[PDB]
Amino acid sequence: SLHPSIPCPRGHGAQKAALVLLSACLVTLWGLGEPPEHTLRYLVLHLASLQLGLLLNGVCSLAEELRHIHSRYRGSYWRTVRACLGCPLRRGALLLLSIYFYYSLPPFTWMLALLGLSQALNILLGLKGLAPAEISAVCEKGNFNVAHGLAWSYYIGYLRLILPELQARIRTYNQHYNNGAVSQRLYILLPLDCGVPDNLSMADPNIRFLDKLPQRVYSNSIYELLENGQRAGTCVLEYATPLQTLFAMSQYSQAGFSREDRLEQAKLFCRTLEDILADAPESQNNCRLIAYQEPFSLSQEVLRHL
Amino acid sequence: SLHPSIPCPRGHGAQKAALVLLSACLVTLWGLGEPPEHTLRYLVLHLASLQLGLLLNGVCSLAEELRHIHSRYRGSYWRTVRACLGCPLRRGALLLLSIYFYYSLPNAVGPPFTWMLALLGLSQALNILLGLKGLAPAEISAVCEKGNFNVAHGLAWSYYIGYLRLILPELQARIRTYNQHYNNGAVSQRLYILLPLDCGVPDNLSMADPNIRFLDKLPQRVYSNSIYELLENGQRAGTCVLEYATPLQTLFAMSQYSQAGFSREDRLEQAKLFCRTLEDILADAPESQNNCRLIAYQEPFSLSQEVLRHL
Amino acid sequence: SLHPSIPCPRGHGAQKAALVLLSACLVTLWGLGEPPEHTLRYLVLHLASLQLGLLLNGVCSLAEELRHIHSRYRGSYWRTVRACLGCPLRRGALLLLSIYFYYSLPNAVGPPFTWMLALLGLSQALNILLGLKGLAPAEISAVCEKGNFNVAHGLAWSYYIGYLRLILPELQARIRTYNQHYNNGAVSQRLYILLPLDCGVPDNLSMADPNIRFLDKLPQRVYSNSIYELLENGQRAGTCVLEYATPLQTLFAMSQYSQAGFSREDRLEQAKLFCRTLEDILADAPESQNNCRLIAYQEPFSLSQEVLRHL
Amino acid sequence: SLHPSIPCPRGHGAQKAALVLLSACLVTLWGLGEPPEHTLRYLVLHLASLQLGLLLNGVCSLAEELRHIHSRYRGSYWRTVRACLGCPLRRGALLLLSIYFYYSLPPFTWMLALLGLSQALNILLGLKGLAPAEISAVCEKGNFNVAHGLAWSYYIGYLRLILPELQARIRTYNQHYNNGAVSQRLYILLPLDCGVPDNLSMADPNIRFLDKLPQRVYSNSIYELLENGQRAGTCVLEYATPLQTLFAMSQYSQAGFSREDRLEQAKLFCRTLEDILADAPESQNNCRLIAYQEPFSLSQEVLRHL
Amino acid sequence: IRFLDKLPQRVYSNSIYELLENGQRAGTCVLEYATPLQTLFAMSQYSQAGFSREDRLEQAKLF
Ligand SMILES: CCn1nc(C)cc1C(=O)Nc1nc2cc(C(N)=O)cc(OC)c2n1C/C=C/Cn1c(NC(=O)c2cc(C)nn2CC)nc2cc(C(N)=O)cc(OCCCN3CCOCC3)c21
Ligand SMILES: CCn1nc(C)cc1C(=O)Nc1nc2cc(C(N)=O)cc(OC)c2n1C/C=C/Cn1c(NC(=O)c2cc(C)nn2CC)nc2cc(C(N)=O)cc(OCCCN3CCOCC3)c21
Ligand SMILES: CC1(C)C(=O)N(Cc2c(F)cccc2Cl)c2cc(C(=O)NCc3c(F)cc(F)cc3F)ccc21
Ligand SMILES: CC1(C)C(=O)N(Cc2c(F)cccc2Cl)c2cc(C(=O)NCc3c(F)cc(F)cc3F)ccc21
């Protein structure tokens, strides 16, 4: 609802389509007309190599982690083992389960040399790479995103400090003058393009700076929303200052934060600001978000919510 | 370098294990003396299952992304496949290799290719639903650090682009102006940014330790800064412009709220990571040309002892 | 899109067509009917032949590099090895597989390892001596433009960082001031930078075409800007702040000298590329907030028309 | 002559040691003791595959240039073929020479298809990549290096315009102020780490600003060189600005310019500026370059040149 | 009257002024106050000069 080009939280399409594929997959195994004794042996041995390979992958990971004991895991060996190999208990059972069934199921020592060699090629040539559309899912589900830190810093830092003392300063400026009364809500502008001009008239000339709201120290502007050369309304406009910071990351070569990522993350920052302003006690319909990506009259969009 | 506890950027110990492992792999293959020809096919066939799996897994992962395409992938089909399947042309060739390496190759162990198609699909769904192929927390922190997906990365950079970048150019002159109009000791020209690893950031700096006491407000948008003196044994041991790290404070309040999904285990990592990233940004930035020095520690001891040794 | 002559950055057509040839080549492998056991073995063996040769060639490449360690590689040997042999931990992971797949695998065609190693160095030595395995310019041009190995990339970024990033913020203010204090048409608020692709840069802009002539130097680290009137049919259709691009002059003078090793055709290659690099830089820079305009033309026509059509 | 850290112009350590490596490897062929016709045909077939290897790489690259033909090659198919395949006839003649040797020397059509397929995997996967050592071994030879541009333009634009009239301005300044004449040479500092403060005082307090030389407008500042609290030299100091641009080039992400390249090109920029000023009419011992790198006394570095 | 620029250059610096009229530029000439009149005013300001206001006015006219 915030904007047609803001991504919704990831749903369960992967779960549902897999279920449909799983339903259709189990159908076609029955069509072969073959006993499932081989199928069960194949499936168990198919999983056995993965668990065996996962151990060596953890072991290969651990050799980097062995010198990391004093750095990340409080100088503890057991915690380091858990990080690479997952839960030691559940993983440990799978290791012994595979070995016992592998010997029973009809070489013995040749596969480990080959499987250990195969795990090397995944580590060395990077065949088992992470698809970014699965990097995004895990990063978003675990809240490993840069935007999730830019929004929470904004809310805890700026919004949660002026929102209580905003409607009061709006009311006082309304009585102290006579003007069309200014709206009692802050209309945060969230330019999705992350190009934030230092003056509002630069984005559109029909929006003009009129006055500064009386006042830790904060300064806000009231803008003369002009339609057909006449005032149609007034409000307090304010760009999201993180949207500059996300932009100025993309310029710098040290950020490792490219243009495709800049737009991709800045989409989250607005989404994870609505999810914050929805439940925040300081938000009592006293702050209204407006987003717009230039394909546009900025003045009408402010009027659109008015 | 900043502290014995701050993690170092990952080395190449991963492939170091693999190369040593491969050294123990070729010898083991040579020691057992297996038929070399079938050893070649088996490794390829094994990699034929692995790379054909990344398509069945990808397509299931692709199903959801076809509904974000208008917003997340700017309404383009080719920016949907490249996110779920890596580079398409590079990945597309490997599939034709794996298909060719499985369509008609002799295979003592393994089903025919048309049989293996069904067995692969059933295997992928089981791993997806149960999460058997779960990401290890060691690799989660490894990939995110490499691709810069950690939340402390932004909080370190935003603390630079917003505040640190805008005040270091004038901080030397502002400190110089105060010293020339004050006592004949003197205040150091280097800013100090406290980075308590515990993220315990008292509102008043003097309350952390009695030896550090607020002296004066440094003269000048209001960029207020309070200069502090370090009272060691009742005498003016040293004075410097000291402040806490606001992003660490915002991290501390981040973990408290339950709408952030920020456990205290994660906050400790980002408390450490935010220091190293701030070390990296200030290492080469033109503004931080020996203009700022960072203080990081973990409270188990006096804070004044650590700041004094830096002067 | 500035001019039809300027080239676009290299695409992925080479990878795209290679997929088609891979697809058609798969048909012939399935049509002739040779056993896949030998086809898989040869293909691994053939790929083994190419990879194993790169070792000695890299060794001969490293041979000159042993004395460059003190100068071009900061005194570390392992940085030198990666420079010549590619990734040390990956290429060695491919040589070892080819060593195992040639010391053990059957070799229906080709010498044994004890024999191939003799011939392997011989072919590379001849290629090094005679330069037979040479890089055609399209391979060099691709590496030059992908890895930013050009002199135009140098000039464009220098031109922006040194000149265009320092007057564009202050260009709008002076144009507004000049328009405000004088009431005789109006001057556009944009600098219409002229980019003559032929690198013909006269000192006097009015001499280029009669319709352009000097009006008044624009009042203001002492930047001299001359605005011009565009006499169309003897009528001042419009006036603008107009100037040439100095680097495109310094590309011309580079080709004149015989010490630069910068041929006439190379000048054209690094002149078209330079203009594209400037647009890619201005279109993303914050300073060019609709503040600068590019006018690129290759002389086959009046200069005033294109300047006018952009107004 | 300039600095130990400056890379020397590429000698011939390859041919010096490759031939020696060949000489040791030329003895071993006589050691094996094998028939010569068998050896002869293998080598010919080896070069026959490479000719097709070069043919397929160029032809695949030719498919891309059908979009750049009207831009890079002036709409002429001849330059399109020449850039990709090298010489249209010399390369073409080798192929049929190789093919005729291919069939003459002891399947045929299936071998050609396999060779084409194996070249496709070379292109898509990119195993046969260009090593960084040979990337900087061709660009240096072909003068396709970024710092070469920032060097010559710094000459045609700045050095060639101020050097002829510098000594006159120094002579005028030396006459006007008596007692401690300045050196008649322009000292262009070249800090190889590219750390260029706006003023020399921040780099080292032992160097003092003295005055600005009389004068478009050219401003050169004369700097005092102090030693143990007393003057030791006076000369015109001016950082090579392209080093500052090179340092700021690596800062921005759109430059595609790494940190090592900054260090690598800064080393190159002095050496190509050495070559220009070695054989230039505007160099009459009136301009001596200073290059240094902290692994220090910058102030004492200048005195060694005096 | 608007300041325009400084005349090109012991060194002597002089100023050229815009002579605005009805909002348009109508003339350009070098305007430079007679500093001795400023000196006379400062003389009348201080009490050690023994130099009254009418004295300053009359000396301005004679100057
Ligand atoms: C982006 C920098 N950054 N990233 C992280 C992570 C931490 C910091 C950081 O260090 N910021 C900070 N600390 C300061 C300390 C002093 C001082 N001691 O004098 C002075 C400063 O500059 C004025 C300080 N600044 C910068 C300005 C900051 C707060 N602020 C913001 N929000 C952000 O910038 C922002 C972006 C993101 C992402 N998250 N945030 C929230 C912090 N919008 C504002 C609009 C107005 C206006 N229209 O007038 C006035 C503001 O502040 C004046 C009042 C200062 N108050 C409040 C804070 O505490 C000190 C006293 C505004
Ligand atoms: C081509 C020479 N070159 N190649 C490389 C690589 C680096 C340099 C170089 O550094 N040259 C330089 N250094 C100077 C220092 C002084 C001084 N007083 O110290 C005086 C000079 O002469 C005026 C200086 N010059 C020459 C002219 C320089 C600057 N300038 C340019 N630049 C380019 O065209 C150009 C080409 C390439 C390639 N990259 N660039 C961007 C730098 N265009 C201009 C147009 C106008 C006008 N229309 O009026 C006015 C200019 O000068 C006013 C600005 C003076 N500022 C500049 C920097 O800060 C201090 C002084 C212009
Ligand atoms: C490295 C080595 C020797 C190995 O250890 N395995 C594990 C394994 C089995 F998978 C199957 C049986 C025995 C073993 Cl022992 C393996 C498999 C193949 C292969 O082609 N598997 C096809 C395949 C399946 F059989 C089932 C499935 F669900 C998917 C699938 F894609 C090639 C080489 C190996
Ligand atoms: C694709 C196919 C069938 C092909 O066309 N050739 C060309 C060719 C020769 F190069 C050599 C002989 C016959 C043919 Cl017929 C080839 C070669 C190999 C191979 O293993 N070459 C090893 C190898 C050498 F023989 C000489 C050398 F100096 C180094 C070296 F590394 C594998 C498959 C093929």
Numbering used by the authors:
A (entry chain F), D (entry chain D): 5 to 110, 116 to 188, 192 to 227, 238 to 317, 323 to 333
B (entry chain E), C (entry chain C): 5 to 188, 192 to 227, 238 to 317, 323 to 333
E (entry chain B): 219 to 227, 238 to 291
Paper text:
STING plays essential roles coordinating innate immune responses to processes that range from pathogenic infection to genomic instability. Its adaptor function is activated by cyclic dinucleotide (CDN) secondary messengers originating from self (2’3’-cGAMP) or bacterial sources (3’3’-CDNs). Different classes of CDNs possess distinct binding modes, stabilizing STING’s ligand-binding domain (LBD) in either a closed or open conformation. Here, we explore the conformational and oligomeric states of full-length human STING in the presence of closed-LBD (SR-717) and open-LBD (diABZI-3) non-nucleotide agonists, lending insight into potentially distinct modes of activation.
In the second class, we found a bilayer of STING molecules devoid of curvature. Using 3D classification, we parsed out two distinct conformations from this class. In the first conformation, two copies of STING are present on either side. In this structure, which we will refer to as the together conformation, the neighboring dimers on both sides of the bilayer form interactions in the LBD and TMD. The lateral oligomeric interface is mediated by the same structural motifs as the SR-717 structure, namely through backbone hydrogen interactions from Q273 and S275 in the LBD α2–α3 loop and hydrophobic interactions in the TMD. We also observe density for C53 at the base of the TMD and modeled the ligand in the same orientation as the higher-resolution SR-717 structure. Instead, the head-to-head interaction appears to be facilitated by the loop following the LBD α1 helix which interacts with the β2 and β3 strands as well as the post-β3 loop of the opposite layer. Further comparison of the autoinhibited head-to-head interface with that of the diABZI-3 structures reveals that it buries nearly twice as much solvent-accessible surface area with an average of 1258 Å2 compared to 664 Å2 for the together state and 589 Å2 for the apart state. The average distance between the α1 helices, as defined by the distance between the Cα atom of H185, in the together and apart conformations is 42.3 Å, which is roughly 10 Å shorter than in apo STING and 6 Å longer than the SR-717 complex. Our diABZI-3 structures also display the same 180° rotation of the LBD relative to the TMD that was seen in the SR-717 complex as well as in cryo-EM structures with cGAMP.
